[PDB]
Amino acid sequence: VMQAFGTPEKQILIEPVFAQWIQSAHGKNIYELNILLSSDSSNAFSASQAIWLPGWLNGINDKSTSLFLQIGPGDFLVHHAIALGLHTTTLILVKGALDARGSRLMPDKKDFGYSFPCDGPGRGGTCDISAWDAFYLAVFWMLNTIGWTTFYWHWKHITLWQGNVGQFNESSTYLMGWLRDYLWLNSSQLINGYNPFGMNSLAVWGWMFLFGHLVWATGF
Amino acid sequence: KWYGPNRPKWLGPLSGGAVPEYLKGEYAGDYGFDTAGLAADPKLFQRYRDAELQNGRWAMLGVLGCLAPEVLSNVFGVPYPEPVWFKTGATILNGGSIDYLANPKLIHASNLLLTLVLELVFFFAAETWREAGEGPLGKAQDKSYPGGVFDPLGLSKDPAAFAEAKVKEVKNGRLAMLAMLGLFVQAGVTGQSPLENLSAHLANPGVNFWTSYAPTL
Amino acid sequence: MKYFTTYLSTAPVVAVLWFTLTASLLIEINRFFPDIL
Amino acid sequence: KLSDWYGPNRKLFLGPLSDGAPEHLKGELPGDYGFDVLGLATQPTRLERYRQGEIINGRWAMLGIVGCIVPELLARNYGVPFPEPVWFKTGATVFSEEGLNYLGNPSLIHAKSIAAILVTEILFVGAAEAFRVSGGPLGPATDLVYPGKAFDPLGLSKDETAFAELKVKEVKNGRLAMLGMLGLFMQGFATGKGPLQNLADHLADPTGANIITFHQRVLSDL
Amino acid sequence: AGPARGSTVKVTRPESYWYNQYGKVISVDESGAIRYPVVVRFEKENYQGVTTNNFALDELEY
Amino acid sequence: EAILGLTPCAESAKFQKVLTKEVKALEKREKLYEPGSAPFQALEATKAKTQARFAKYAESGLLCGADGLPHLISDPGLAVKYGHAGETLIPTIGFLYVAGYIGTAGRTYLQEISTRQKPTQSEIIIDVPLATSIAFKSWDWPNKAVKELASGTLLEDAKNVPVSRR
Amino acid sequence: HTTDLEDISRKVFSAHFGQLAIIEIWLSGMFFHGARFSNYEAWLLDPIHVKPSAQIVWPIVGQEILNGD
Ligand code: CLA
Ligand SMILES: CC1=C(C#C/C(C)=C/C=C/C(C)=C/C=C/C=C(C)/C=C/C=C(C)/C=C/[C@@]23O[C@]2(C)C[C@@H](O)CC3(C)C)C(C)(C)C[C@H](O)C1
């Protein structure tokens, strides 16, 4: 809503300082925090028989490698999204396993087994009360959560490799950025794999892209 | 100074109708003053009693602690950076430290938030033990008057002396509370130290008043 | 009016009223003191 | 009859919408419109103390509002030479050179020391209040709010019904006066002018001088 | 022994909706053939929507 | 003070770039209208507010990133050491006071009506006097919280809590 | 609620009047917004160029950007 009203300076952009601290301790010097391996005077740094350190520090302070990528507010939000997905998947599965043998709505669930449809419309109705149904519910949450992690990994690399890390840093803090500068923009060549003019070697991935859309919708 | 039905009262000789009924002279400092009826509920009265003693005892240590480092700097030559009470605090800000008795080998504290967090944690423990009335230092005899480790000299053993000393405590407490409220308002109005405020009214009884600041409002 | 105040005391009326006041207060604060970050 | 102001058929604060009164407000008191939304008088001891409190603050407010208005009224609409006629500026005029001169006239009181005014106030008004509560030279303290021996010379409080209607007239005039006083404080804070200046500006341009305009101005100064 | 009609009991039958909750005794049956003689009434209805149930003596704490 | 690789917004060029970009957009919109007309006045009010807002962010010690947008510091130690406690740490205390108040008022009203004849009628028809009294008496809610905690009246005992076959 | 078809008919007829009342409020609104917060008189001179508009937004929290040209 801040981006939509033309006021990007009124975004809430929390720095991930705890992850930047850990990165600083590993030897990244971009956050000017000077601790452990990023301080010259520390015991960890000056450990005589360290000897992996010159190689390591060369690697960790090179933009080309993905050895501890730099992070900012966009990284803070998605990491909390992933946390939401891990906890929510866990909650559905843990409830599944801990309410497996019985609950208050059905105290004798162990006598029906892992997978059964329901216990009928009585007691207020009991659809999806078996532990198998908890698994079935949790798979949607797991796909959503790996979805969020792979979208982040991809967009973060695609911008690093093209050089414009600003794109990710600027756009990743609001959801129209994901929709427009990630999904919408990077679907241009894919959907031109076969056109009225002709076809290129992306035509197989084009077709498999619509096939996926169809199979997903058929599941509904 | 006393208890009972014919104790000192708050309007003195003219205190016939000035006493509410629920104040029957059972607790220390009953002068039959409660014009807003706050203590009419007897559970609220127990609460407020504890509160009046907590505010009072804190006020006593406070007024002693607001005056003592100024006096030490004045009388003796103890080189406090900003020894005034409303200016202490800022010493730990910027890069400055807090040195007890202005000696940089004594506490040498520079982390404000570590200080505050230690204080809240220590208080969360000790205040929870206070409210429960039982803890490491023992079980309390009364919520406001714990005794035991808290009374190492055994001055509460004698019953009559204890009854008197409760009246001494609550009256010093009240004074200290008015002192502290004094300190706050004086700082807010005059902007100077409270020993400078005293010196200014000792030098000149006259104009050096609240009625040199009142015209400016 | 003899039971009209009891109707006003019911949950959706009290909710609409309370949200309206709370919303109005936040709007008026955000008129006087805008852009607090 | 004393029935529109007492008992179960009294007039209540919400008007036609009123479907009854709280339980602690029974309708045995003057000016009981059944208005205790924050429930401050749910204890009976408090309801007694706050009854007295309301009447005393009212009486003092009625004397206050009149005192606050009239020396401005003389100085504007009659031309009495007051140094500072505005009530919130008066009081520093004892630290002037001519002092506090009743009606302007420099021989009338001519006070210069706040110490004497304060000490006489503490003594005099200290006495008068302690008498009010405990009883004193002008009678016993049988009723704490309506004594009536020395303090009712014209014998107005004798006709029972008339006493119960006058009682309600006291409270309601007292409430008006406390709202008036509160208005003097806030308008003092808001405008920095006197009350009758404010009344003059309202009367000049009613739309373009009120509390709405004031809030606009505040908003324009951010 | 039985509870008194009108007394308060606590259910200790684990499969019940009202386990660890308190109910009022309405009736006790005195025959020994009856398997659940005590009738208890509760304030909170269960998922079925009923508020009463028969219990044995070894399922109540009185 | 520049920490964590961030520049202060007061001495950031990208910050100024952003302010320029917003003000330029408003100028373009103003070109269409006449210098005295009321749309014009609206766009001027908008531009004024905008410049004021950036000025405020500049004198608040806010810290800008490479994007030129202010960034908040949420470790309390870093916040307090470098004067950024107004970004998250004070709001924390402010939220936790108001949330404790709302909870306390709600719990109080519920514990009060639970002793009535039909307690569920007092949930769909609110006892408005009772609710206002509770709302205003609950400003000192830690009194009740620490009392309940230390005394033991906060928690129901496990024997009285309904639970499943476990 | 009931089994009586007369009582049902009566409820239906009366509810119908309430629907017409709410429709009439909604139309009155459209005419009022058109009389007091629109550019209808401007549009009447130049239908081809002026775009019809009859909802203004209040300035608060930055929403005034929705008041387009
Ligand atoms: C008195 C009201 C009240 C109180 C004190 C609590 C307290 C709590 N809730 Mg509960 N809850 C409530 C109402 C309340 N809730 C209501 C009305 C709902 C239905 C939406 C829920 C649904 C709910 C869920 C699904 C969960 C909690 C959880 C919790 C616990 C953790 C905090 C939290 O998750 O907040 C979150 C609170 C909400 C999501 C609901 C908002 C509550 C509103 C804002 C306040 C009460 C409104 C009420 C109408 C006020 C009327 C008072 C007036 C008449 C005086 C905490 C014990 C969590 C828990 O179990 O932790 C272990 C949890 O998962 N609550
Ligand atoms: C009884 C009654 C009534 C009343 C009343 C009255 C008169 C109540 C008045 C209460 C009052 C006036 C209570 C003040 C307390 C002050 C305290 C606790 C101070 C602590 C101070 C401390 C602990 C700290 C001090 C410092 O931290 C400081 C500040 C700065 C630092 O550099 C140094 C140190 C750390 C040392 C009514 C309402 C009139 C009518 C009703 O009917 C009956």
Side-chain angles (χ1 to χ4, degrees), chain G residues 12 23 36 44 46:
Chain G
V12 167
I23 282 165
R36 301 293 225 67
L44 259 187
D46 193 1

Side-chain angles (χ1 to χ4, degrees), chain F residues 29-91:
Chain F
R29 284 175 79 222
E30 270 175 67
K31 286 202 249 292
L32 279 49
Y33 297 103
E34 300 142 308
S37 51
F40 196 85
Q41 306 307 294
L43 290 156
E44 294 302 49
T46 302
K47 194 190 320 147
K49 284 203 34 177
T50 303
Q51 295 161 321
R53 183 180 39 243
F54 273 78
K56 189 184 154 297
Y57 289 168
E59 320 98 41
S60 186
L62 281 194
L63 259 38
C64 270
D67 45 15
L69 303 177
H71 285 5
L72 310 186
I73 313 297
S74 27
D75 166 66
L78 274 177
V80 159
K81 203 210 172 100
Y82 291 114
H84 294 122
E87 297 166 353
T88 319
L89 194 45
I90 276 57

